Design a protein around this ligand. Structure first.
Ligand code: UP6
Ligand code: UP6
Lengths: 217, 218
């Protein structure tokens, strides 16, 4: 995936008007938008097509897919039907649940992003201890896209080591959660940024500022 | 605790509005509690919850297996309860803060959180099973009163019931299609969750009635 400015906008505003207005204000800086349940459950899945129609941006559905294989398949199908280019799936539920997602993605010409370790403090309780193994599982399954924590650069670096330089890695937790844009890009191909941009007084200036700080990258 | 009619919860995972409504309507006399998940919600919209409330006199459990960071979990719960869901199912593996975020919204909005400890599918044995007992204990420490456990592993369901105590409410999926037995599951769970065995049957009503007849003494 070729992400403009190595910056993915996490559009978690829950109002259609605000989401569209803010995204439009920073459109010149991005071409990849991560849409999650906050916006989808508030405005409906048709919002995905609206974004593609207005911005032509690629859409990553951050649905943290974490159900049994049968249900995961249905979730992916509904998501790709809505126009999502990729979907984020949890690895904690096991290999069969991830495979179900990979099957649908292959069938519809989309990509699966495997979330190995999360960025919040609670991730240390159960996810972190299984993260490396989840990453190895991704490798065994042929997964090429991963999600790792900006909040723990050493952990993000370990994830990169496991998956190799060829795999694609995106990373959330930048800004609001404490992650540094430049440091995160030492290991991730692209950073995910939400609040630092969409909650800023001037979203455009916020995005421009982040890009300025990583201009050499 | 919620009074689930016939201790049977319908997992309505059909993705077509017309079919979902038809089938739910046909088993309406046997079930007053319906679990709606993403297969239907992502296909027909959150308003489907509103439509089910209007058409049937059923409680709604949103099986969204909430598994994000605290900030995002709060937003998901708010949107879900705003839509009319009585309760929401949340994953415990992402940690205490993520669960607490859901509990806080449920408390302020007057709704309930169901904590999913162990899952019923084969893959659950890779990472979830090993953390299940601790996730359950965490739920008890956090004040969680409603839980979800696997019918496919009676031994595990029994242990979960022990950890949460007799006062906690426990519902269990994996019955029918996945192999779980209704009666045996009800030895530990307050109610069983059944999807495909009912909604894919030539006669959903007869399928539901059959399951209920098999557990009549319970
Ligand atoms: O480990 C993870 C996985 N996903 N996200 C998601 O990435 C975005 C981060 O946004 P923020 O910049 O506003 O913190 C949100 O949509 C959140 O659900 C995380 O923050 N951490
Ligand atoms: O551990 C779990 C948690 N949730 N479910 C959900 O419960 C329902 C089971 O339906 P079934 O009777 O068709 O297998 C589906 O909605 C599925 O996502 C499980 O099966 N196992």
């Amino acid at each position: 995936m070729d992400v403009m400015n190595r910056l993915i906008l996490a559009m978690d505003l829950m109002n259609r008007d605000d989401a569209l207005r803010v995204t439009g204000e920073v459109r010149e800086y991005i071409d990849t938008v991560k849409i999650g349940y906050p916006l989808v459950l508030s405005e409906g899945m048709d919002i995905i097509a609206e974004f593609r129609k207005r911005f032509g941006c690629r859409i990553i559905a951050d649905f943290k897919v974490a159900d049994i294989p049968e249900t995961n398949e249905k979730i992916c199908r509904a998501t790709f039907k809505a126009g999502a280019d990729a979907i984020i799936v949890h690895g904690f539920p096991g290999a069969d649940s991830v495979r179900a997602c990979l099957n649908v993605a292959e069938e519809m010409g989309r990509e699966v992003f495997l979330l190995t370790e999360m960025s919040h403090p609670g991730a240390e309780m159960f996810i972190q201890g299984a993260a490396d193994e989840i990453a190895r599982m991704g490798v065994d399954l042929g997964v090429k896209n991963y999600v790792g924590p900006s909040t723990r650069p050493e952990r993000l670096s370990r994830l990169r080591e496991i998956i190799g330089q060829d795999s694609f890695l995106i990373s959330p937790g930048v800004g609001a959660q404490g992650g540094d844009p430049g440091e995160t890009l030492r290991f991730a191909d692209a950073i995910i940024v939400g609040r630092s941009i969409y909650l800023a007084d001037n979203p455009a200036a916020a995005a421009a500022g982040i890009i300025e700080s990583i201009k050499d990258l």
